[PDB]
Amino acid sequence: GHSLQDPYLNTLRKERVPVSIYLVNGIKLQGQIESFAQFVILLKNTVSQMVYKHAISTVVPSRPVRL
Amino acid sequence: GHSLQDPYLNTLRKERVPVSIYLVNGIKLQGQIESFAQFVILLKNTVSQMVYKHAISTVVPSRPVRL
Amino acid sequence: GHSLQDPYLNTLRKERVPVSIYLVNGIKLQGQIESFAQFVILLKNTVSQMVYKHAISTVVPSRPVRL
Amino acid sequence: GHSLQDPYLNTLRKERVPVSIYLVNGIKLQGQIESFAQFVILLKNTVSQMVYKHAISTVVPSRPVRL
Amino acid sequence: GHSLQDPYLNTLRKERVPVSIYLVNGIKLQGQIESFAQFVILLKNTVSQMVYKHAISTVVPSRPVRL
Amino acid sequence: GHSLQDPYLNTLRKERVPVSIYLVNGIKLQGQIESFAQFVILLKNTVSQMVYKHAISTVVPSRPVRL
Numbered sequence: 001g002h003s004l005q006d007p008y009l010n011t012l013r014k015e016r017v018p019v020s021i022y023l024v025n026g027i028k029l030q031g032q033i034e035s036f037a038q039f040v041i042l043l044k045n046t047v048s049q050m051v052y053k054h055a056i057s058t059v060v061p062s063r064p065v066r067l
Numbered sequence: 068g069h070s071l072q073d074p075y076l077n078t079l080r081k082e083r084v085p086v087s088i089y090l091v092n093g094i095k096l097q098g099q100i101e102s103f104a105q106f107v108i109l110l111k112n113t114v115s116q117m118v119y120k121h122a123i124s125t126v127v128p129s130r131p132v133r134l
Numbered sequence: 135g136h137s138l139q140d141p142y143l144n145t146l147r148k149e150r151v152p153v154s155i156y157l158v159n160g161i162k163l164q165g166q167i168e169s170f171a172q173f174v175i176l177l178k179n180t181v182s183q184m185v186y187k188h189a190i191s192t193v194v195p196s197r198p199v200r201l
Numbered sequence: 202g203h204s205l206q207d208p209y210l211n212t213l214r215k216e217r218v219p220v221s222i223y224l225v226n227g228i229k230l231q232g233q234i235e236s237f238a239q240f241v242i243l244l245k246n247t248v249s250q251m252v253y254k255h256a257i258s259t260v261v262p263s264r265p266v267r268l
Numbered sequence: 269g270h271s272l273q274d275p276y277l278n279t280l281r282k283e284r285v286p287v288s289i290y291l292v293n294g295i296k297l298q299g300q301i302e303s304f305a306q307f308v309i310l311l312k313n314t315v316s317q318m319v320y321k322h323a324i325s326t327v328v329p330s331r332p333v334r335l
Numbered sequence: 336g337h338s339l340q341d342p343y344l345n346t347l348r349k350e351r352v353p354v355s356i357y358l359v360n361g362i363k364l365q366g367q368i369e370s371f372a373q374f375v376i377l378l379k380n381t382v383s384q385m386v387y388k389h390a391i392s393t394v395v396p397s398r399p400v401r402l
């Protein structure tokens with residue numbers, strides 16, 4: 001219950017909001033959240049890549065989003 | 068029970084205290100805690116970004132805060 | 135239940151899709167997913183090496199794949 | 202049960218022993234353990250900052266301490 | 269159940285296969301898997317050292333191995 | 336059950352074997368295992384410091400040890 005991560009990612013996915021996912025190695029990825037589960041997020045643009053959440057620092061939308 | 072993280076973050080959120088969140092990659096973020104849950108914190112200023120706690124080193128308020 | 139990681143990796147394995155596995159240390163590996171379990175993925179080419187998921191940032195297929 | 206971390210940190214807190222907390226990013230912090238819980242330690246000096254244990258390498262007291 | 273890590277490491281141990289264990293800090297170790305458990309692997313050559321799995325990126329055998 | 340980490344560390348502690356603990360940040364520590372629990376090891380020499388296991392890569396004894 002009392003989850004914030006699910007509502008957040010689900011909004012970004014539903015509204016097709018472009019995001020930057022900054023990784024713990026300094027790599028910045030860019031795409032749309034196509035899908036997400038317990039341990040991974042699927043980020044689309046050219047191909048859909050599987051990002052491990054443990055590797056993510058911050059999810060930054062290109063636009064403000066509201067829950 | 069016996070939690071310290073929840074009371075701490077909830078105070079920073081309630082009192083809108085400006086914080087620095089230092090990440091494990093040396094990146095320093097700055098904003099207000101808008102919201103927080105089990106695995107993430109939502110830090111606001113320009114847009115509300117989702118920070119993974121596993122990526123956080125230290126939360127540093129701009130002012131002393133008391134529990 | 136509601137898993138996305140298993141369907142994703144199983145597709146890449148079944149269709150023998152070439153992938154890049156980017157590690158949290160900046161190392162890029164390349165091979166085919168031969169096998170995967172709870173904590174590891176087995177990536178084949180010259181020899182089959184065991185990659186720990188906690189060390190993985192992103193799995194990137196050489197081709198789009200559909201679930 | 203059979204805990205060593207709690208007795209250790211509680212001693213440092215009770216005796217107000219100055220410590221260095223070395224982080225996994227090479228950052229050295231310095232303060233007094235004001236408080237600690239399951240996932241975080243609160244280190245005081247100028248303001249009380251919340252340090253995530255997953256970000257900590259070693260806790261080093263300025264003086265020997267005994268359990 | 270459905271484990272792949274145990275069968276893999278147990279084969280390398282049984283057949284005394286020389287391996288490279290690449291760590292998340294870029295350090296490459298070399299030895300034989302003497303033993304392994306839930307959280308650690310014991311790698312032998314000059315002395316038997318205890319490697320934490322959370323620190324391991326990939327296990328790479330010097331020869332192909334089959335399960 | 337079927338633990339290898341406990342027997343290993345307990346031997347090093349009992350026999351006062353000098354060890355190098357290599358950390359995931361490249362820092363090499365040196366001391367004697369004074370004590371250990373679920374998440375930490377206490378390494379003695381000048382003062383007894385608390386090392387978090389999640390920060391440890393490998394434990395390397397100065398001498399071979401047998402279980």
Ligand SMILES: [Mg+2]
């Ligand atoms: Mg690092």
